Amino acid sequence: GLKAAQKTLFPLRSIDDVVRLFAAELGREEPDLVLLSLVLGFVEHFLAVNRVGLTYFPVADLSIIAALYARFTAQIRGAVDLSLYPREGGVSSRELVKKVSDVIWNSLSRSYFKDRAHIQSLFSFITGTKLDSSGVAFAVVGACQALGLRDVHLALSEDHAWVVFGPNGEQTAEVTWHGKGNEDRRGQTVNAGVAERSWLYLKGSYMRCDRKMEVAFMVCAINPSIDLHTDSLELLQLQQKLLWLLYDLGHLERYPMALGNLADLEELEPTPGRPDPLTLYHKGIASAKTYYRDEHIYPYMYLAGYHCRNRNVREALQAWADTATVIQDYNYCREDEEIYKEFFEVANDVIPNLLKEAASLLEAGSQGSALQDPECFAHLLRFYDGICKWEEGSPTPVLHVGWATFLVQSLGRFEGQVRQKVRIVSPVLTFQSEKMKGMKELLVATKINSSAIKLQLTAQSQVQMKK
Numbered sequence: 001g002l003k004a005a006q007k008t009l010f011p012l013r014s015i016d017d018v019v020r021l022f023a024a025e026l027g028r029e030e031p032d033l034v035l036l037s038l039v040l041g042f043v044e045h046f047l048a049v050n051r052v053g054l055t056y057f058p059v060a061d062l063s064i065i066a067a068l069y070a071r072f073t074a075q076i077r078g079a080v081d082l083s084l085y086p087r088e089g090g091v092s093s094r095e096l097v098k099k100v101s102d103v104i105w106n107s108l109s110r111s112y113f114k115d116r117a118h119i120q121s122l123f124s125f126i127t128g129t130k131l132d133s134s135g136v137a138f139a140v141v142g143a144c145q146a147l148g149l150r151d152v153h154l155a156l157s158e159d160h161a162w163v164v165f166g167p168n169g170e171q172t173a174e175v176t177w178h179g180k181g182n183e184d185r186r187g188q189t190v191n192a193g194v195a196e197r198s199w200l201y202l203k204g205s206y207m208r209c210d211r212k213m214e215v216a217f218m219v220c221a222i223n224p225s226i227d228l229h230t231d232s233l234e235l236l237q238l239q240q241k242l243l244w245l246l247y248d249l250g251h252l253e254r255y256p257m258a259l260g261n262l263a264d265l266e267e268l269e270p271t272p273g274r275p276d277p278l279t280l281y282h283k284g285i286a287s288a289k290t291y292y293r294d295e296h297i298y299p300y301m302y303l304a305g306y307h308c309r310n311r312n313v314r315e316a317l318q319a320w321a322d323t324a325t326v327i328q329d330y331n332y333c334r335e336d337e338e339i340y341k342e343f344f345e346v347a348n349d350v351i352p353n354l355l356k357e358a359a360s361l362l363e364a365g366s367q368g369s370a371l372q373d374p375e376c377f378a379h380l381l382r383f384y385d386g387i388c389k390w391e392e393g394s395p396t397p398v399l400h401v402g403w404a405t406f407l408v409q410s411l412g413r414f415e416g417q418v419r420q421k422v423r424i425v426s427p428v429l430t431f432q433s434e435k436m437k438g439m440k441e442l443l444v445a446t447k448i449n450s451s452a453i454k455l456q457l458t459a460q461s462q463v464q465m466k467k
């Protein structure tokens with residue numbers, strides 16, 4: 001409204017006061033997304049963007065929040081005339097959704113850095129006329145809620161956002177941009193992207209948020225970063241507390257990435273009496289398997305990263321092998337470059353550095369080393385197999401000779417007597433990719449044939465003429 005009952009907890013004088021507001025809103029029929037995002041962006045601004053004068057917590061006075069809320073609802077009510085877009089069946093039309101998107105878009109500053117921190121919230125929209133990509137989508141959903149459009153909800157993949165709406169919430173609409181230098185599809189469905197089996201649209205196994213999940217999204221969206229070196233402890237604590245509130249109420253059940261975020265926060269600063277980070281990573285993975293056909297990559301990446309940071313080479317390799325087993329059933333499309341970058345960095349930087357250190361530790365006498373464990377060699381092979389299988393049938397290739405040098409290096413880190421123990425079945429491993437099937441004999445020789453491996457991985461037809 002704001003309604004009277006929404007105003008009773010103000011002023012918000014602490015982290016716990018903000019948590020009480022979120023609890024009260026989540027207890028309501030429909031939590032107020034506009035209120036909540038304004039409060040979060042207010043406190044984030046005064047804890048991360050400008051801490052001048054800070055002594056404990058930036059007190060959120062009702063008069064301040066209510067004025068920002070009024071600026072938002074005035075802008076949306078004034079610019080979106082509902083009578084022009086009659087609600088057939090108590091659901092919204094594509095034209096209405098496009099109009100709200102246009103209103104948000106046309107309010108933004110003409111030029112700014114879209115990758116900046118702290119431009120995700122409606123506080124940034126109102127005070128700075130700046131939003132990031134998914135912030136635009138969220139703002140469209142908040143605007144629609146303020147207009148009474150109960151059917152418009154946020155849709156999320158692992159690298160993009162859009163809305164669902166209409167009869168049975170079955171319609172999709174693009175409302176924001178994706179990436180940089182991609183061409184805009186605003187107003188269109190996402191069915192072409194689903195049909196092409198791109199990562200970007202997750203084969204249709206994307207998140208369809210309810211209002212409580214939209215709250216979880218804003219909380220995940222909090223950015224504690226003050227600069228490259230420094231995080232706001234106050235914001236970390238707020239995000240963590242709010243994520244646990246949501247978890248207790250059941251609202252992270254269908255939100256794999258939120259469970260990983262929560263796990264990462266617990267690793268940094270554990271809450272007594274709560275599940276360990278590992279338990280939480282596994283719940284993230286279980287959420288993906290349960291609700292999303294185990295078609296998400298980041299639940300395994302979150303797990304692998306944990307094991308990496310804890311120098312648990314075996315378990316990190318297993319999780320990355322799992323990431324690849326997901327990706328293998330996708331086609332690598334135009335606009336999937338973020339997941340390509342993640343796979344590239346794991347294969348060509350993270351794994352090599354992990355195994356370099358394992359090699360040094362083996363020279364020094366380590367026992368139980370991943371490098372002497374044939375199941376760890378198998379995980380390494382499964383990782384490459386999934387990547388090669390991904391590439392099959394894709395409209396753009398994945399592998400090139402830059403990947404081959406690191407594969408030869410990585411294979412070389414395992415002695416032949418270890419590599420020879422893996423049984424490749426047409427420690428036991430089955431390859432799905434034709435590339436790795438062709439590589440099988442090369443993988444067990446005491447001396448890795450580097451040139452033959454390169455030829456097999458990149459399917460380069462020929463060697464050099466002269467020489």
Ligand SMILES: Cc1c(CN2CCC(Nc3ncnc4sc(CC(F)(F)F)cc34)CC2)ccc2c1cc(C#N)n2Cc1cn[nH]c1
Nearest residue numbers: 134156157158159160161220257258301302304305342345
């Ligand atoms: C944990 C992690 C990240 C962290 N990243 C994980 C994905 C998170 N994304 C999200 N988290 C909650 N909600 C949403 S909704 C959404 C779509 C849209 F942005 F709205 F469009 C995205 C997203 C944001 C943080 C990034 C790369 C990572 C890992 C873990 C690994 C591993 N292993 N990697 C890969 C890597 C390691 N080195 N270099 C890359």
